[model samples]
Target chain A: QLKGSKTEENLKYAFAGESQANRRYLYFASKADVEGQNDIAALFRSTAEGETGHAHGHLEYLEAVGDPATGLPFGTSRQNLQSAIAGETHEYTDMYPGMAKTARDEGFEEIANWFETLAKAERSHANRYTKALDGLVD
Target chain B: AQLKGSKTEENLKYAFAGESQANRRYLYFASKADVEGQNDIAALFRSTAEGETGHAHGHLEYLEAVGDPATGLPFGTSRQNLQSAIAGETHEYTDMYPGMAKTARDEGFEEIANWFETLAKAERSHANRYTKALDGLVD
Candidate 1:
């Protein structure tokens, strides 16, 4: 277990978040060539891969350090899945951009600017989730 | 990070298309990079580009499945996965890759760094794609 077990829960959220991210980048990467945004696509694809890697690493850490890895932290139980989705939405929609806005207003130029880029990325994720839900529900 | 004057819904949808397009385009380019002796970058691009395509497909699918098609994600949502893909990609490229590039370099993954450098360039263009995709919707 972590020195603070809350780390485990947080990691769970992070891993779940990463799992979704991995697929997002994969989707971008696959379509880049056709879109003529090869370079852009590659960047997103690699970026998502990085998330996948982070998720994988977290899993490994949990296995090696935190409690044993459980069944998919997301899909198995509806409640777990709901929790996962809620967090995912927050990360994509509010928390991320809020982070940037706060920094920017405070005049943290570099920090805020970087977050601006990140915030845009997060906002986009919310759209992806909307899309994914459409597919799965259908 | 909320934009001061940004149209949240409109922007999200607009950004969505470009993100999808950008992801796909990157993979298409990665395939070529692979063929051009930029193997390290190719591998990097191939893996990530595939990820982006996956995201794009997922987004398009979600948009199609959701509300009246005329109006999306505002009054209600037909699917939740729509947001997931965007969230997923943001974390990957913005949060993870930069750190990894550093680690790979430290570990002497020269080719890996080359690929990552190529990837960074690709990422830099994402905003442009967003603008291009959004431009069509407003005007």
Candidate 2:
């Protein structure tokens, strides 16, 4: 069935990446806007649009436009931070490392490198969330 | 790399859709966070969602892909929306994600390949949910 096809798998991932990028950038753009960083905001908006384009391409290929993915249940900022910390910590400490190793073993160095980079990035993300949470507590 | 081939256009459109979806999802999440008094987290999500919108807009500007028939379907009535959702999910469950996954594997994007596989199953479940919603809507 199409559901089990490799092509479908690729499209799904592609769709996901573009989708995430689009939203992440938009969020950044809004922050920039609030900070009166007009240029930065414009840049962010542009990049967000680019991400959307990629997402659209993937979705088109898949011939699907289903409902969006759900995030964590609603929570206080502190709780949200905690949730984010857990996810980021897991990515760097376990998930990304495992994926990276598997990719390396499979001789896909590019994929391995990508995983490693993401692992490192996730660490930074976790720290940022922790700091933010600390600020709230104070 | 700078041509207007059908495949290229379709690819761009797909990317645009992905980014658009992500942007909206983050905003939705951010709203909940804000309401829950997660000011900083809400800010984070809001910023990221804006970034996604920027990316989507960039893609739209390029190749003059704006206003393309494939950009999106207009919003319909709630009932119509549910029906559309049902059909879209069914397609993903039965055909879309699976085919995409297979292609990713063939192309050696193994990680993405796994993603496709996972999404396929998820979409199937989504299809069932949408089906339930549709049933309720009709009666």
Candidate 3:
């Protein structure tokens, strides 16, 4: 039904943004607590509220409020580490490099840098996993 | 292409929230990795956390979901956070989604309307769960 409407497209992106933000805020809240930033933690939690409201509103506008299939394969700790490793490897080796190059070519230097940063991070992530695996596997 | 109205604004807000959530989750997980003596895994978590932040920042810029008026991410204690979750879930079930669904029905957006109805019911469940969590931790 939402085939050709520009509004629907915006709604989709907005939905993604809000959903991600909610979880991100929760993490920040936790970190604040860990760091003894009690007031700041509260603020993060409160600010997180804006995202839920926005996401729901967008869903209403698009008439697209429903749960997505989040069949996340939550394996054991070791398994999760492996999964993380694989994901990071893919990003650094395949995804980020391509994205960075394309952004650079398109004259979006900042965006390109962002991509490169992510790529390097992914490599770091993969390396970390590899090291962990070494201890666990042997 | 930006859309306006409560729902439009709402969606952007949601997008901003989602990116922030992903970023924080990765960082937290990384911390866990460090505690477990998995420095490499921690590094990975930190890296992905940054990547997630990049996405979050992009969405925030698009939504102008930041600053003085505080149009962005909110944080709190574990106790406070649970309470916030409960409140949000309650609003969706009791007010927001229901009204939206009704409007969708009136406007002949059957698919949209049905989705709202479904969400309303789901949100109610979320509220209850949050309430339980809050009860255990807070009041």
Candidate 4:
């Protein structure tokens, strides 16, 4: 079987790095909170969230070759919303549906149900994104 | 290095996954240690986690998957941050989890499959939360 390109595999590295950092930073924040460093704790927690955001971007592109337009790192509020809207829309409408069928065909009924639940949750995600996009200011 | 696909290489794959999982599990333990004011224990966990990371990375490099692998991420405004999160969660459920779950089942790791499914649902909830944040609806 053909392996993924270097970029694809590298994104996994990035994802792994950032994901670990997120939790580590949270622990740091918790320690800071214990010492009464409210501001520092906030900073650590804030950066933890940022690392999480970065991890998500890498995960989103983990299987792809290059930076996908819909999952880009930085964009205007409107553009970011569009990226999310499209990504979630695809998950519900396409990605999860196909995976669920595969699980069913493989006789993994529990996994099949799991996939169906994923699809339903993704649909809710898309709807929420759509609502958010609609509420955006002109 | 030993010829690729040898038993050694197969063992490396198992070792890599084991080490990678241990790193995260240890990190979680460290997080709990901190909450309990076990600073020294938390530090111990963090260092042990780092060692596990080194082990995993070593196995991966030995397998020749650690070339100058290029990567990047999109990041910016708070709003875009929410979008990044939404897209990330969408990918987790629709992608990474299902893929991992299937492979785990194929490999007879039903427990891992169950864990991944639970994670997939949690990721979906994250997507919904980000969507709310984007709409200025999060408290």
Candidate achieving the largest lDDT: 3
Q: Please rank every candidate by lDDT, starting with the best.
A: 3, 2, 4, 1
Taken over the whole model, the C-alpha lDDT of each candidate is: 0.43, 0.55, 0.56, 0.51
Tens digit per residue, CA lDDT, model 4, B1-139: 2224344434444444444444554455455456656565556557656655554554444444321111112322343334544565577668876776676566665654565566567666656755664585222
lDDT of 3 by residue, A1-138 (tens): 553444345455445545664765556566557866676567557656655665655544542322111213322346455656665666679766776676566555665676677578668767866776677631
Off by over 4 Å in 2: A1-74, B1-29, B36-38, B47-139
TM score of chain A per candidate? 0.43, 0.49, 0.53, 0.56
| Candidate 1 wrongly placed segments (more than 4 Å) | A65-138, B1-60, B63-139
- Give lDDT tens digits, candidate 3, residues B27-60: 4456556667777666866776676666655544
Q: Tens-digit lDDT track for model 4 on A1-138?
A: 113443344345445645644544454455456665565456557656665555555544432332232333323344444555565577568756775675566555654565566568657756765675586553
Q: Per-candidate interface C-alpha RMSD?
A: 16.3, 14.5, 11.0, 19.5
Cα RMSD (Å) per model? 16.6, 15.4, 11.2, 21.8
Deviation (Å) of B80 in candidate 2: 26
- The RMSD (Cα, Å) of candidate 2 is 15.4
- Clash count for each candidate, listed in order shown: 68, 78, 32, 3
DockQ of each: 0.04, 0.12, 0.15, 0.02
Q: Against the true structure, what is each candidate's TM-score?
A: 0.32, 0.38, 0.43, 0.35
Among the numbered candidates, top DockQ falls to 3
Here, model 1's chain A TM-score works out at 0.43
